[PDB]
């Protein structure tokens, strides 16, 4: 004879099921929201010392090469 | 051919373990009886002492 436990389990059970589906929607909504200078100077100074022609495209690639 | 070779191979070890295990158990089992005979002999000595007291 324990009715308090019955109500307690029913509370946690339905809440978990209800919020379990809400978690899916929350993950999808936040997931959909997530889906949508100094290094340039360092390389440029090096190219200056060798007095070689430098272009922003080359510097951008070298900068991207450093991060890669 | 590889399943037969591995079968006889592992089966050969199992037989080897069977013999050595048998040869070891028979030895330990005999030692157990040997200790029992020794205890029985000495137990008689204690039994003789107790009977002497009664007399």
């Amino acid at each position: 004879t324990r009715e308090e436990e019955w109500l307690d389990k029913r509370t946690k059970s339905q809440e978990k099921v209800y919020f379990d589906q809400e978690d899916r929607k929350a993950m999808k909504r936040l997931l959909e929201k997530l889906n949508t200078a100094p290094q340039n100077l360092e390389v440029e100074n090096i190219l200056k010392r060798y007095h070689i022609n430098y272009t922003q495209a080359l510097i951008d690639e070298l900068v991207d090469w450093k991060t890669g | 051919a590889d399943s037969i070779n591995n079968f006889l191979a592992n089966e050969y070890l199992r037989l080897q373990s069977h013999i050595t295990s048998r040869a070891l158990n028979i030895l330990k089992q005999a030692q157990a009886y040997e200790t029992m005979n020794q205890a029985a002999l000495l137990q008689k000595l204690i039994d003789d002492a107790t009977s002497a007291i009664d007399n």
Partner: protein
């Protein structure tokens, strides 16, 4: 020269027959001829030069007529920095096997509480690193703190966390008095403080004192070993105006030990079998643990709730003496939330809009009202469910669970059990994190991320990480 002599020995109660100059009550008597030092505390004068005392050690081996020496003063224990970082016995003997204890002098364990005119009460927030505590039940430096918990609820581990967070980096000294608890926990704490460098063998270090009255000790010793630890804190308080951190283990064992012998002492049992002097006996200890003009003592004492029955006389009387209260609930542990601090039952004398900032007080009540409303909805939700509720009620239940789950904080002492490294939360980040949730900052993200997190930012980053993972 021994004046008294053993006349009656029953259990832990021992009577001494004196010829003349009876010793005052509470005096310490030394029995001669015992394999171990036995001390007897005078408690009652029965007349005819008879005195009834309680034995601190096992009475087995005693003999009627054994000479007893009168010291003329109550049980005196060594005080001073020599006790820092060393385990001591109820009678002052070192049980750590590190040698004798050096003390500049010996003070008695019995003294009158400080007067009211020189009380010098003060309120100062104590950042313990626990967000649930620093928000709902703030602690006051120099005021009593109570940890009400049942059998196996997490109060022992919580004390260890407070030590790891509060005891260390403390200019003043600290005292740890463990009475009535199991001895296994004592060995663990000693090794823990040693590894954590809280205590060390090198002199001039180990700014922390340890006192143990574990179960292995017989009755009477567990009821007075608590006074031994207090005397150490009193020395560091009066002689030096330094803030002392007194970490008292479960104190219910003190009042319980008194009842274990109250029957043999002649007292009539109370409604629940306790001694009639429970209020006075407990009051004498609480009144002594207080801040004064000389120094201040921030006492962290735990109260064991037997059978989870808060109506017991022992804890019920303790609430009146405590400044900050921390009632542990067993329901939270079933859900996995730790620390299982009851937000509604837990209260703090510092929880006043005038004492603390109005924003801190506002966020505190906002969480309490939110949880209180959610608890009422449990009834209707059990039959109809959250779906049948209105949008207003749905949001209340949604945020209430997220806030309730967010209260869970993993600490360093819980790593072995959970496996997640501890974390420290500041008061500013604590108030800001919950204040943002109350406004609905985290209502969008799932409630799963608001579990065992330190700050709100940590929960959001974890939520985004799970998104890219799938």
């Amino acid at each position: 020269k021994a004046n008294g002599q053993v006349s009656q020995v029953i259990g832990a109660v021992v009577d001494v027959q004196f010829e003349g100059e009876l010793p005052q009550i509470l005096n310490a008597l030394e029995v001669q001829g015992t394999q171990h030092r036995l001390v007897l505390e005078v408690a009652q004068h029965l007349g005819d030069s008879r005195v009834r005392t309680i034995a601190m050690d096992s009475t087995e081996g005693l003999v009627r007529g054994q000479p007893v020496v009168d010291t003329g003063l109550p049980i005196s224990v060594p005080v001073g920095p020599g006790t820092l970082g060393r385990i001591m016995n109820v009678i002052g003997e070192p049980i750590d096997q590190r040698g004798p204890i050096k003390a500049a002098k010996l003070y008695p364990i019995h003294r009158d509480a400080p007067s009211f005119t020189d009380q010098a009460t003060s309120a100062e927030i104590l950042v313990t690193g626990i967000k649930v505590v620093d928000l709902l039940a703030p602690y006051a430096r120099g005021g009593k703190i109570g940890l009400f918990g049942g059998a196996g609820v997490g109060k022992t581990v919580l004390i260890q966390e407070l030590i790891n967070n509060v005891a260390k980096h403390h200019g003043g000294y600290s005292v740890f008095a463990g009475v009535g608890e199991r001895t296994r926990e004592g060995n663990d704490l000693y090794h823990e403080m040693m590894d954590s460098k809280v205590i060390s063998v090198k002199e001039g270090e180990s700014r922390c004192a340890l006192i143990f009255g574990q179960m292995n000790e017989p009755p009477g010793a567990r009821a007075r070993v608590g006074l031994t630890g207090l005397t150490v804190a009193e020395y560091f308080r009066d002689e030096e105006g330094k803030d002392v951190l007194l970490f008292v283990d479960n104190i219910f064992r003190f009042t319980q030990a008194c009842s274990e012998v109250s029957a043999l002492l002649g007292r009539i049992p109370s409604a629940v079998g306790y001694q009639p002097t429970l209020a006075t006996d407990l009051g004498a200890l609480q009144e002594r643990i207080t801040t004064t003009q000389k120094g201040s003592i921030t006492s962290v004492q735990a109260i064991y709730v037997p059978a989870d029955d808060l109506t017991d006389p022992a804890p019920a009387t303790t609430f009146a003496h405590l400044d900050a209260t921390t009632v542990l609930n067993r329901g939270l542990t079933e859900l996995g939330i730790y620390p299982a601090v009851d937000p509604l039952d837990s209260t703090s004398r510092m929880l006043d809009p005038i004492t603390i900032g109005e924003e801190h007080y506002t966020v505190a009540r906002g969480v309490q009202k939110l949880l209180q409303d959610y608890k009422s909805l449990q009834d209707i939700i059990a039959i109809l469910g959250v779906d049948d509720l209105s949008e207003e009620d749905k949001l209340v239940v949604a945020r209430a669970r997220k806030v309730q789950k967010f209260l869970s904080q993993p600490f360093f002492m819980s790593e072995v059990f959970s496996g997640i490294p501890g974390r420290f939360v500041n008061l500013k980040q604590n108030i800001a994190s919950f204040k943002a949730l109350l406004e609905g900052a985290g209502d969008e993200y799932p409630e799963s991320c608001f579990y065992m997190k330190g700050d709100l930012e940590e929960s959001l980053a974890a939520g985004r990480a799970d998104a890219l993972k799938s």
